[PDB]
Amino acid sequence: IVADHVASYGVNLYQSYGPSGQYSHEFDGDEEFYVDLERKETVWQLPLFRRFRRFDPQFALTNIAVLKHNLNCVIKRSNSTAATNEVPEVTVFSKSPVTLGQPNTLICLVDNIFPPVVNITWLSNGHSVTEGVSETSFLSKSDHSFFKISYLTFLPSADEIYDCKVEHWGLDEPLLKHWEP
Amino acid sequence: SPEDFVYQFKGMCYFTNGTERVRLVTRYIYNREEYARFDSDVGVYRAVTPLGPPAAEYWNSQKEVLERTRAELDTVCRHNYQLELRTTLQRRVEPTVTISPSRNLLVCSVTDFYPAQIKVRWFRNDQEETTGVVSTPLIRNGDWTFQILVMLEMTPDVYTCHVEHPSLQNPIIVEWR
Amino acid sequence: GQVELGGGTPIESC
C-alpha cells in the first residue's frame, strides 16, 4: 500500500497474559493518544491535541471488550496456538547533543517486541533509576509486532554511566545496552 | 516463558493528495497473523488466512455491520483527517543543527524536527562533500520529533552543513571552522 | 465536547 499519510485510528491490543489491553491512535507512526483503560481517561501526547482534540474513552473500553471476546474464539479455532516470542533489539541514544549541565534525555528504543510484554528499566552506575523514567505505549508496526521507547531525563556529568536493561521472554538473559556518549 | 495469546485490531486509514484518495483497511490479527481484513477499495470483509472464513463470511452477512464499516471511510478516515489538518499537518518544529568533532570525523547533529521531510548536505569549502559523508536513517524519537546525524570524514578550511526542512523558508547553514 | 471516533470492531460467531 502507498500513501502520503497513514493513520491508525484504532490500534486495539488485548493479550491473555495479565490480562492486559491497549487502545491508541497513531498518525505517521507517532502515537496521538492512548486510553488508560483502568482510569477511563484519554491521554493525548501533545499539548496541541489536548486543547483541540477530544476522544471518548468509553469507545476504547467497548472495543477492547470485543477484543476479549474475539480472542477467546480464535484461541479455540486455532487449537490454542500461542504466540511466538521474538528477539527484541535495543538501541540507546540521546535526544540532543549532550552538553554538561544542560538537561537532556536518553532514549532507549526497544524494537521488534512480541508478545507486547516487555520490562524496561534504566541503570546509573549499576544502580536502578526510578526517577525521570518515562515510557511510550506499545507502538504498532506493519509486520504486526511492536516497539517501545523509554526515556530518562538526566544531567550530564563526567562520571556518568547509563545502561538500559530490557527484559523479555525472547531473551535468554536481561539485555544491558550501555549508552556510549 | 509463560504462554500468551495476542489479538490485534488495526483500523488503518490511507491518504493521498489530501482528501482525493482515501482508503480504509481494518486488519484483524491473531498474534502476528492477520486472518481477516476489510478493504474499502474492495468494500467487503475478506479472509486473509484460513483462520477467518468463519469471521469474514459472518460479518459480510450482517448488513448493518458491513454498511457501517463501509461508512467508516467518511465517519472515521475522512472526518478525523479534517482534525489532522487543524493540528498534526500544521505542526512545524524547526530542526536544531549542531556540528561537533566526534570522539577525524565531523558530525552534523540535526535533532528535534517535524515533519519527517528533511535534507542534509556537507560542504568542505563551498564544494559539496559526497564521498566520506555517512548519514543515518531518520530516527523517530517517539515524542513527535525526529533526529538525524550526518557525519563527514575530514582532514584540515571552513566545513559547512546545510539543512532544509518545510519549517524553514531559509535553509540552516552552520559552519564548523 | 465533540469527539472523534475510531474503527468499530465486530463480534465473532461464538
Epitope: 477530544r54 469507545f59 467497548t62 471488550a65 470485543v66 | - | 465536547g1 471516533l5
Partner: T-cell receptor
Amino acid sequence: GVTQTPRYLIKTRGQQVTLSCSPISGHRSVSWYQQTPGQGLQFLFEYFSETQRNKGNFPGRFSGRQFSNSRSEMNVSTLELGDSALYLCASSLRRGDTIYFGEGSWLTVVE
Amino acid sequence: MKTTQPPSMDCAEGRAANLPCNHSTISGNEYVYWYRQIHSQGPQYIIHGLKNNETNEMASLIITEDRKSSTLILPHATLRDTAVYYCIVRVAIEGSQGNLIFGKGTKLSVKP
C-alpha cells in the same frame, strides 16, 4: 423482539424495584430509558459485556446489571413519587448499532 | 439536543407526510436517526442515514447535501401512522458517545 418484565408494578415510597429485560437474540448491548410526561424520554445507562458504559444524569439510586446472556436488570432504590414512570429497555447487536426498544415496565409509586 | 422539529404537524390520510428536521451542528461522524412512538407504547425504529438518501419499507429519508437538515417522508399515511416522530442525531460527544437523546419531537396527526 425485546422483552421486559414485569409489565406493571405498584410500589410505595422507600421500597426498591428490579426491572428485567431480555434483549433480542444475538444482541449484546442494552440501554435503559425512563419516560415521564414531564421530562420526556431520558437516558439512564447502557451495558455491554456485563459492564456499564455510557451513563445518564440519574442518582446512584438508579443502578443496573448485565449478565452473560446479555440480559440486563435495572434497579431503583428509595423510590420517590417522581420515580413513577414507564421504564423502557432497548437492545442493539453491539454498542453503536441501531437500538430497538421493548414495551417497557410501567412503575407507579404511590403514597 | 442537536435537532429541532416542528412541535405539531397535521396530515390528511392517504397523502404523503414530510416531517422536517433541522440539525446544523451535526458532524461528519454522527448519524441521523428517526423514531416514532404510538400512544404510550415502545418507540419504533423507522430509518437512519448519514448523508445519502435512504429508503426502507416504512419511509424515506432525505438529507441535504450540507447535512444541516433532513426530512422523513411517509408516502402512504394511515391512521396507524398517528404518532410522535423523533428526529435524533446520534452524537459523538464525550459522556454521550453513541447515545440517542430524544427531543420534543413532532406530533403527526393523520386526519381521516
